[model samples]
Target: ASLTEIEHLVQSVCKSYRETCQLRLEDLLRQRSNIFSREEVTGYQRKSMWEMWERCAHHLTEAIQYVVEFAKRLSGFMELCQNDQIVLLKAGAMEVVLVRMCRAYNADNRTVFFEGKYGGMELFRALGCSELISSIFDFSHSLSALHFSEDEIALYTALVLINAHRPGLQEKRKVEQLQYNLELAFHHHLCKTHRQSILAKLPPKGKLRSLCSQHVERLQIFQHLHPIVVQAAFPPLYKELFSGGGEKHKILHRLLQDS
Candidate 1:
């Protein structure tokens, strides 16, 4: 018997992975850049370095948890689709809900004083929030809003997870983390000052910070809506997947795009 060296295939796979990976790193950087632009936080070195460190360390745990969990779900779906013969229409739908919630959490965290510390500022800066908000409105109006595709979710989740872990990304992450740790190490040096800043900016009485606050509050609740996937994500393929009835299945994305 003879065997072929496998190094060539491995190199091809690695090259492909790197090219795709390069794109995601750019995206992550762009998102981080947006946060800095919005906040205009500059002259980074304050005379009181201890005070600076203390201001940046609040609420980081929750944000990281969201990103980590979303990445897990995405990786699960990506792997399942490739080999498992699993039901994923609903997985896609669920992922969209999770993504939206994560972004909302990020938005809420952005308004804080030491937000730049936990990678929040950099993440936000890269995200291009205004464009994202516009896309949110666009998707909100789609029929597919109720039927998020597992394939689409897998695509984006992979993108986020890949970039989130890469060396360059984590370099920024470390910087942000250090800033936050400094804030905590400094005994929340700016807590009182930040709170006062927020209070001063509060809208009058019932006038409010738009109507989005309630929407944000609702997202924080983590409630589930039934997986309407059969009817929604796979309106055409449901019977075939579960009941083994109806016409032979067709790929909707391929059919619809005809490209």
Candidate 2:
């Protein structure tokens, strides 16, 4: 596609998703994190925390749903090898969801508005995994501080999901070409919008990966400790997308079932 065509496509797709997805805070950039929480877990906390994790996972699955739709709609995404598609979706969906959370993040108040409630660390503490929650809050705060516009977040989501270096891949060069086009589109959009040259690099360097490892670590432990609860968690795809690793066919089934 020509530069103009690509720009229009990205901006249009993003605008469509941003309106209906829970990106309220970003829309209000037409508007507008900080942190709190403990880092310890005990048996008592674990026993009582399943409800919170389940509820939180429900919201998270909602984000994954949006991320999947947004990702699959990106230019040339469907043209990739089938395995490559699931690889990108499984690995990058949550990160994209996390990135978009800045939209619901109320930076000044340090609360993330979700499911019609503004919740902070004190609120998320019910999950009994504050360390991961706090790190997520911190990342959201940092990204929120950047004050990225909807258009930028759109491209950012696309850029992340198209990652060329993900562990498993059959056709790196094809994905790389699509990524190159998306990057050029982001650079051109940034040039037109903000003065912050620092953001030329994606907002996250590797911290998202670090935080996700922290999350996946906590989740694996959770999976082992409370296999039943983890298995029955609301929204089937939560474990499938976040915990990672599944046969491609199984992964693709999870991907298509929701549609």
Candidate 3:
């Protein structure tokens, strides 16, 4: 039967979430600082736009990896055809990343703990997508205010992946069925753990959709502006994740084969 007890569903996602996002916050900070402190110590304050994008892409690439590992473990995820799975990843992974970033946000100081440093927007100044940066921080700030448990974040990540609306899906009915089950599970979870009930968790509606589009637009613009930087720094899966072409599915399929 497709129906699962809500506790089991939540527990399953939590296990995957913990397993994939393994590093403790303290360790992430320590490791990130250790890796980049020398650059800061060298008084290399000035950063190039390409450099910022490259590093940002590096972290985003890793985030996407965790999303891949996390998503496939969820109920009915691998049951979807590879084509449908790719569609979900292309559309929903970034949303999950944004949700994931809240844990790294240090709202008291208004800085995000990224790659080991607690820096604010100034850290990414050269990225040239200031508006997108502001929106991302705002999204993270709002969600951070809610202080959701890891379980909520994981279940929400699952809901985002199971969304039935992403186009190019060959198995819409199958995907929709999965979404229905997740929604039921999430609703059950809400009844058990009530809290501040912030306005942020109301499914983001069009807000996150816009942030994601802005990111894609900025990425495409960056690619055209500095094709060399992207060619050198963007991971193959990172490039494949965003690129539009007939060959995309084939590349995605090959990448997933290693799964």
lDDT at 19, model 3: 84
lDDT of the candidates, in the order given: 0.30, 0.72, 0.75
Residue 115 CA error for candidate 1 (Å)?
16
Model 3 Cα shift for residue 7 (angstroms):
2.0
Candidates by lDDT, descending order = 3, 2, 1
Instruction: List model 3 lDDT by residue over 1-259, tens digit each.
Output: 2345767776787787888884555554453333334456243247777887888888888888888888877788888998898889888888888888888877776677776566776667678898999989988898877777777777777887789999899989999888987877776677667632632355455776888889989998888899888877777777777643312435556645676
Cα lDDT tens digits for candidate 2, 3-39: 7876786676577556546556534343332233233
- Candidate 3: the clashing residue pairs are none
Q: Which run of 10 residues does model 2 get worst, by summed lDDT?
A: 32-41
* Candidate with best TM-score: 3
List runs of model 2 lying over 4 Å from the truth. 26-47, 196-202, 244-251, 257-259
* Alpha-carbon deviation at 115 in model 3, angstroms: 2.1
Query: Taking the tens digit of each residue's C-alpha lDDT, what string does model 1 give over 1-259?
Result: 0112223322332333334321242343345433444234444332233233222111222332333334333322233222121222312222333333322222323321234332333332322233433343333333123332232223333332332222333144533432333223222222422432332332232221222343233222211221232233323432232222323554322322342
Question: What TM-score does each of the candidates earn?
Answer: 0.21, 0.83, 0.87
Lowest lDDT block of 10, candidate 1: 82-91
